[PDB]
Amino acid sequence: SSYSGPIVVDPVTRIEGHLRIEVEVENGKVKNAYSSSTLFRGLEIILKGRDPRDAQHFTQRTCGVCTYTHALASTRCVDNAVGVHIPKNATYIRNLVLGAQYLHDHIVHFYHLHALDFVDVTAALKADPAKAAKVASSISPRKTTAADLKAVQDKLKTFVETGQLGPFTNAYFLGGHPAYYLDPETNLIATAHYLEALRLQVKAARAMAVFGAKNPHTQFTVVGGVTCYDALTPQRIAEFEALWKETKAFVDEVYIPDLLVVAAAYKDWTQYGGTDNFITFGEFPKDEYDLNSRFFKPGVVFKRDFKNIKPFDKMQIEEHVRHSWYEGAEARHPWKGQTQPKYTDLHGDDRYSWMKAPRYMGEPMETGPLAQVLIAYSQGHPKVKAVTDAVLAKLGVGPEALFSTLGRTAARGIETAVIAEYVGVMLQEYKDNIAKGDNVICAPWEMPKQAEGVGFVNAPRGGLSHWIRIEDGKIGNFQLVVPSTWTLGPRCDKNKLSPVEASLIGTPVADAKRPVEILRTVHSFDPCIACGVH
Amino acid sequence: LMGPRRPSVVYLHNAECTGCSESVLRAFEPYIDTLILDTLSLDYHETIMAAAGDAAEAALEQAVNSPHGFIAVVEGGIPTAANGIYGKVANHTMLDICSRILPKAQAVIAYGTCATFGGVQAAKPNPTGAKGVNDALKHLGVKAINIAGCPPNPYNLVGTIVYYLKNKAAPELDSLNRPTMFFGQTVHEQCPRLPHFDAGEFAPSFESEEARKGWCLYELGCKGPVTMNNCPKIKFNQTNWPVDAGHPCIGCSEPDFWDAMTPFYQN
Ligand code: SF4
Ligand code: SF4
Ligand code: F3S
Ligand SMILES: [Mg+2]
């Protein structure tokens, strides 16, 4: 019957970076999977011996999709190593730029990276724009008319009839595909909003540059605080606030209703792509030295036991290399990390990736929006509970539906909505603090000759940590352990499949030549391979 | 993917962080939807293209072999150590991919300091033997237009493409092969803090009242005086740039800046 044999997807497109996915399929279902990351840069090697103040400028270039996040993690790391307690306003400004990063990032992910796995853009040409407008207006308080959507259709028609399909060339949906379910009108609404999102994300990114100089790769953080005295002014705050408000409207009125209409149409995707274990570091601190002061709290869950959330112990992280292209087989805590590349080619000596394999108490952990949302929900976070319950009820599913590719995709939207609202709270607190006469944004500090430090960021893809050993006032060791490393790194020396590998078992594949189902699950984790490998 | 009326662009990703791709998405007047629907035909781009795997490889082959010709835009350095093994796409080294495709382009633009000059993975000790495109491919006669920065201003990419399509040739280039229309001035000579520099009015620390008042950042490491870019003129995202955010320039449009400009907080 169905397909039996290997499938390779190399390149996996609509991700950051260079990923090769290999699977074994038996009778039309995946039975085995390998996550192979195929670029190494070696930023940890390059950092050795340098000034710790320089680390954030190099590590920000780990990734320009999750731009800022690594600058923030390195600055938190060196802040921590030096023992500086940055001023309240630096925490607010850093937190506000990070909330703006999440909104930009998740909006681009859903439309520009994920949605072509679920949207047949060419079928949009056959839609009835008056019917589509009615549908769009029923799911959102924003009113959409037939002419609005016809404009999009006319534009797409001209594009397609030129024969130059550009980014849609050889799309898996061309010609039709049995795993693509949407009707023409829903394809047209999603395609209209894909196009709208291309311009909206310009504003979402601009919000970061208001305080943060520029996007991509911000330039406003220093050890001890931030540099942007202009961020105190009513004019810059107003500019930020207007971009945030417009971005939040898009989240609330365009992205989440689209997410829900697509999830409703693909409710069979509650049955694939689940994982067992979850880790999250918390984000948006009131106190830079207390993770439990964060709006989202850290936590660890094994085997979906959310009634027994475990504290996060940073000493229980080790990064494995037995199935990676590094010397030897010894796992290391990142304050004793090693980055010693040794290539053996695909599956040479059972090694198949440039990512290390982080394990927590020896277990493979999913991180990212589904970890953040489920753990916060289970901690009683009222905003996360309110919108995940509303999402579950709209979709007519129980909470077990969350342990899936569809649930992960939905969690990315839930956290976007919750963060978009929380940015307004942070913004008000920042305004209030300035109004009390606190205009301080940077604190003085001194470089120790010897120190250890760690910085924790819950980035749009999950728990990020940067770890420094300072020796003679220089970088003795600098290790990045990044969310995609957790999620998409390979097997460990106990041969445990990583979250992405395990999640792929059981994926149906209708057409091995166009294996969109594999992309749906892989993309649901929002992979970043420059992040994962560095 | 292409043929007819819009010029074909093949966008390659080597050893890169995807910050240069993101910078193009920030394109303003024209925006990226106008660029992809009206101005150009974006025929290969791993970050946003629909096809993956063999289907993506087939799209790349059909664009590069088009009798209509294509323009290559290249992001990222080429790792050359160990015969190119540190970077592969579709199980081909990036060195091999670029060696085969870039000599077929009608024009090549190296976009971002990694593609132009080798960039962050080329910083000491350069474990992957990363090189800029023209260094890596000198022997094949490739001469890419270099649009530097980490990432560059996307104004500079669109400006160069538009120029190229109009005039059927590269604009005037400097000795680093960068367009003089964007890279002809130091960011310092354009900086609003230059009167403080002239007056010897330097911030001694980021927490200082001098920094609050906008004094010059040279003592805190600013590389504006040795960096060519149009940052103070064009700004980024239509609203800001590093020293207006209070932070020194780190020299990010210059070759080897990771090693030449460090420590970033000293001059
Ligand atoms: S030039 Fe900078 S922003 Fe562009 S790919 Fe290289 S590291 Fe990333
Ligand atoms: S802040 Fe930098 S670019 Fe501006 S005047 Fe001073 S040295 Fe020059
Ligand atoms: S760091 Fe780069 S972005 Fe401009 S201000 Fe300096 S050349
Ligand atoms: Mg690492």
Side-chain angles (χ1 to χ4, degrees), chain A residues 61 217, chain B residues 15-20 75-76 111-114 120 149-152 258:
Chain A
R61 280 65 178 181
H217 287 164
Chain B
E16 47 84 36
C17 79
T18 315
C20 286
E75 172 180 5
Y111 185 61
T113 293
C114 294
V120 68
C150 193
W258 297 105

Side-chain angles (χ1 to χ4, degrees), chain B residues 35-59:
Chain B
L35 280 325
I36 291 326
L37 258 18
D38 297 324
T39 312
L40 266 18
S41 191
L42 184 58
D43 292 336
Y44 187 83
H45 193 310
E46 284 149 13
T47 317
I48 63 166
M49 66 192 285
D54 289 325
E57 284 210 77

Side-chain angles (χ1 to χ4, degrees), chain A residues 214 219, chain B residues 150-151 187 227 229 231 236 241-243 248-253:
Chain A
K214 62 194 174 75
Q219 202 156 315
Chain B
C150 193
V187 343
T227 301
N229 210 164
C231 311
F236 291 92
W241 71 288
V243 345
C249 176
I250 66 169
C252 80
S253 51

Side-chain angles (χ1 to χ4, degrees), chain B residues 11-12 23 35 51 147 175 192 212 240:
Chain B
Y11 192 115
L12 298 183
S23 72
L35 280 325
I147 303 170
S175 67
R212 181 181 305 279
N240 211 351

Side-chain angles (χ1 to χ4, degrees), chain B residues 189-202:
Chain B
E189 67 185 292
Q190 303 171 267
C191 179
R193 304 187 182 206
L194 182 66
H196 291 296
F197 173 94
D198 283 2
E201 289 171 347
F202 303 109

Side-chain angles (χ1 to χ4, degrees), chain A residues 10-11 13-14 16 18 38 50 54 57 61 64 155 164 166-167 169 201 206 209 215 227 229 236 239 439, chain B residues 1 6 14 17-18 25-26 38 46 49-51 53 88 90 150 206 212 237-239 245 259 264-265:
Chain A
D10 189 351
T13 53
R14 278 178 292 117
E16 189 298 325
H18 294 114
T38 64
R50 294 192 190 259
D54 290 342
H57 300 114
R61 280 65 178 181
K155 186 83 191 167
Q164 301 181 264
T169 301
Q201 58 80 34
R206 180 178 298 128
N215 175 130
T227 59
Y229 288 96
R236 282 299 190 182
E239 184 189 1
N439 61 180
Chain B
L1 351 67
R6 283 164 296 303
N14 296 319
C17 79
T18 315
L25 285 55
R26 309 295 181 266
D38 297 324
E46 284 149 13
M49 66 192 285
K88 303 189 175 176
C150 193
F206 289 107
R212 181 181 305 279
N237 315 89
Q238 294 66 239
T239 197
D259 288 299
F264 284 126
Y265 297 97

